[PDB]
């Protein structure tokens, strides 16, 4: 396989460490503890994810409305 | 309505040992 780069502003497929999803990558102002992989909301959907290589926190904005 | 995604981002952890 081959790694890919990041497209923040467009709805695209998300596969991170096996976790599948779809949404928009946005800048996250929320503080996370480095000892955790990712986090989710009460809807059992991923609202944020941490990049495995570089340390960062990005929010998952839902797409496909209608 | 539905918005179908286009590109695909695949990020795997940097591999120290295969």
């Amino acid at each position, epitope marked *: 396989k081959k790694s*890919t*780069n*990041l*497209v*923040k*502003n*467009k709805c695209v497929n998300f596969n991170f460490n096996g976790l599948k999803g779809t949404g928009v990558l946005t*800048e*996250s*102002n*929320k*503080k*996370f503890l480095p000892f955790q992989q990712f986090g989710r909301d009460i809807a059992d959907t991923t609202d944020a994810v941490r990049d495995p290589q*570089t340390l*960062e*926190i990005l929010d998952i904005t839902p797409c496909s409305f209608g | 309505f539905r918005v179908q995604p*286009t*590109e695909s981002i695949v990020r795997f952890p940097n591999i120290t040992n295969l």
Partner: antibody, heavy 120, light 112 residues
Framework: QVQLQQPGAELVRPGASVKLSCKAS????????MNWVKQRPGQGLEWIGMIHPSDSETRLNQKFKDKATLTVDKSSTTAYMQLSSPTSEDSAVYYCARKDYDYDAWFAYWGQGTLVTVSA | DIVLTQSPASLAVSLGQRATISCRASKSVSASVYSYMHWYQQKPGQPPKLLIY???SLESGVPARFSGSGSGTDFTLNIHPVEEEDAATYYCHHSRELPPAFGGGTKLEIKR
């Protein structure tokens, strides 16, 4: 090696159409964004807009709405930008930069620039 | 949006001194323990180039005399030791919000 090419200068009369060329080589023209920057001498840099070449979706500044128009040709991997009815205040230097995304988004590479002079 | 204000407009720094340029943001761009900022160097007749990204690192090929730090709105960017080739126009940028904005610019004069 990644290199961006643009023509040196272009002459246009007011009321006509302006067509610019940004050539991409060495990287995938689809996966990466293409951003445009307007540099007017003495006014500093200005942000024109962005375009996603796959879906043609564009992002335009509030000031350049209804004026600038962005389009891409995926066959030759060359991005185009048009300006409807350019005036004397629209004369400036135009760049096309690529955003390499690691955490925050900066401008990794730049073009040569094209001087658009509007004069009869 | 976020409008960037740089002061002063023209800074005169001689050989052996330290330069300071402040880029203010209307809103806080700091998120995830880091901050969103970038600082460029544009010479006349040449396109700008990346130097320091995210204030915490130095781009490859850029000399060590360029340093940066600061948190919150007001940032401070230092240069030392200053060299005769450091005269150019400097800018600051933030990619957080959208549509993004560019700095006002600062001209650096090398005293002789």
């Amino acid at each position: 090696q990644v290199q961006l090419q643009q023509p040196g200068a272009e002459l246009v009369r007011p009321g006509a159409s302006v067509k610019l060329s940004c050539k991409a080589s060495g990287y995938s023209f689809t996966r990466f964004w293409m951003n445009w920057v307007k540099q007017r001498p003495g006014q500093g840099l200005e942000w024109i807009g962005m375009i996603h070449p796959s879906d043609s979706e564009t992002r335009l500044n509030q000031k350049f709405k209804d004026k600038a128009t962005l389009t891409v040709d995926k066959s030759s991997t060359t991005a185009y930008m048009q300006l409807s009815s350019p005036t004397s205040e629209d004369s400036a230097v135009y760049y096309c930069a690529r955003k390499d995304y690691d955490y925050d988004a900066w401008f990794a590479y730049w073009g040569q620039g094209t001087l658009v002079t509007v004069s009869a | 949006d976020i409008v960037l204000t740089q002061s002063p407009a023209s800074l005169a720094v001689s050989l052996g001194q330290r330069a300071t340029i402040s880029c203010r943001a209307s809103k806080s761009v700091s998120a995830s323990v880091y901050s969103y900022m970038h600082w460029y160097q544009q010479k006349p007749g040449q396109p700008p180039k990346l130097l320091i990204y995210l204030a915490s690192s130095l781009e490859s090929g850029v000399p060590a005399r360029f340093s940066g730090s600061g948190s919150g709105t007001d940032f401070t960017l230092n240069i030392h030791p200053v060299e005769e080739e450091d005269a150019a126009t400097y800018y600051c940028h933030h990619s957080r919000e959208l549509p993004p904005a560019f700095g006002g610019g600062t001209k650096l004069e090398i005293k002789r």
